[PDB]
Design a protein around this ligand. Sequence first.
Ligand SMILES: [Cl-]
Ligand SMILES: [Cl-]
Ligand SMILES: [Mg+2]
Ligand SMILES: [Mg+2]
Lengths: 327, 327
Amino acid sequence: TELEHWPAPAARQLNALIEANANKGAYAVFDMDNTSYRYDLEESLLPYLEMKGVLTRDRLDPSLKLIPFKDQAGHKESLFSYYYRLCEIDDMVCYPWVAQVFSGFTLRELKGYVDELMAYGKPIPATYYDGDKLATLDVEPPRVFSGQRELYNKLMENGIEVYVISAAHEELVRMVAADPRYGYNAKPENVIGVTTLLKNRKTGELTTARKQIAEGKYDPKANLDLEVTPYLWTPATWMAGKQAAILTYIDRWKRPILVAGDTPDSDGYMLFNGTAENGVHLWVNRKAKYMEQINGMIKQHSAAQAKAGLPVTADRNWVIVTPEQIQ
Amino acid sequence: TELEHWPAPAARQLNALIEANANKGAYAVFDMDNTSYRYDLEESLLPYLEMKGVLTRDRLDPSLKLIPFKDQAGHKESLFSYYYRLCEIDDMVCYPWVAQVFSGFTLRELKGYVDELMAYGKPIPATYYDGDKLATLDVEPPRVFSGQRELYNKLMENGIEVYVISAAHEELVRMVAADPRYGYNAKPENVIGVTTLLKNRKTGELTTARKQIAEGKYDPKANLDLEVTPYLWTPATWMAGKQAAILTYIDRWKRPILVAGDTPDSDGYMLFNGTAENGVHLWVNRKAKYMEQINGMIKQHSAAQAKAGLPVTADRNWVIVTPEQIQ
Ligand SMILES: [Cl-]
Ligand SMILES: [Cl-]
Ligand SMILES: [Mg+2]
Ligand SMILES: [Mg+2]
């Protein structure tokens, strides 16, 4: 497997990293959304199911009705629009909510919709408030990066285990990352995302994949008909929770030799505190105001590592690509 | 302030650390329940509130009824019983639940109950299911540890900042650790705990203390008539979340020179991954099973640090005390 869809000097650094760390029990960690594929799964699945009439404001779990809807002018606010208004309160409100909003569905159902969104091939209209003006924007469905496909498999082929630490629902991510048809071939147990309690409709037993994996009795098939509930399981895999997730589910002391991300605040803990001393920081640059923010982070952390008497590793081994360079 | 309620060899080790780290920008982290005082706030407050009529299954948020209550022909399941039953599903179910259970009150009311509980001073009767049979037990309210009251102050007096990182509700913990009538004298902003969205009933505004502190304007009094809701803010401060909280709210690179704990799974991440190399692991031993569980972990982590090419720090500077010895 060749790093064919990669700028040549990135394919260079990455091949060197892989030769240096083949077959040594090393591991690598990837963000999913806008890192391993272009665009975002939850952000397109929400409006896509609203538009099918599958998700509607009145099916919404009452624990998620945090603030009043804004129905000014005989227009009924969409769930998409509401998500944005929560994001204005805070990331910490809106990050869980946009995983929880898919409550009430069985995994089997959600998998069918995920596959429909992946095969869709066309933008999805949504609405939202820009101040008080009702507005329009089109949301793209996920688009698998070919280069990431290549890198995931080439890491696994060289005995470097591959994990996904994503801020989106673990089970939604797993339906992309662990399904052979998308070309990642992640092991399902190595997908780490936001978790909520899964409920048995007949028995009312509550479980989660994380629970079953730690107990060594994980089989993704038997969770198919369980319902996604919104009750949150921790650690929550964003911000420092990404680093928490590495400690809890991967290794307490061995660091990843590669960490891939695209959102500065949310991926920045696993990137700066997580990556091994000589590991690669894989960055996908998709928003020039994020490029400048990450560069500001590299500077400031470099300086703060030094001032605390630590080797300066924050500026080491960046591999920076744009979405178009790996598409 | 003098370290008088300590065994002398511990007080020597602590005084020596305080002297080596005086006015150097150092800080210390303390668990609260069963570390800073004896017994547990939430576990005594919840059944206190039940035997007073304040907190009942009716005024229980519908988002927190995850399973059916188990009523036997003549007796109604208490909230303490249901709580034990959720612990048997997973700590990751019962840990947030027993914080969220205090929802639907204002911080003013709760500050009332806490000060009451702290003054109550006597054992509270509570009931649960031992297997399938109904059982009774005596739950004790917190008793402030004089030793810890002294250590906190001696640390502040030598310009060693003091933080509290608890798996109990941040606002509950604040009401004891920051309120000077208990003698800890912790800065309100330096108390970190499990956080839920606080609601302005008037306006519908949603905030949390962590938000206000991160934004640079925090006044505890401004919050007293906000309603505690159940909606969970992260990172959740238990297990690897405690280490996540150090990164997020304290410092990304500087490590505490003192970490204090009493629960091997919940406190282990900040104890082993957090504590500075030349820091003190301060351990309150309140259960025989926990003392050997932490000794087991110390060995395991020592070996795993060496294997990973790290300096072995896990077995270093253990200050071990019983509740009795610091009471
Ligand atoms: Cl993210
Ligand atoms: Cl704890
Ligand atoms: Mg991303
Ligand atoms: Mg404790």
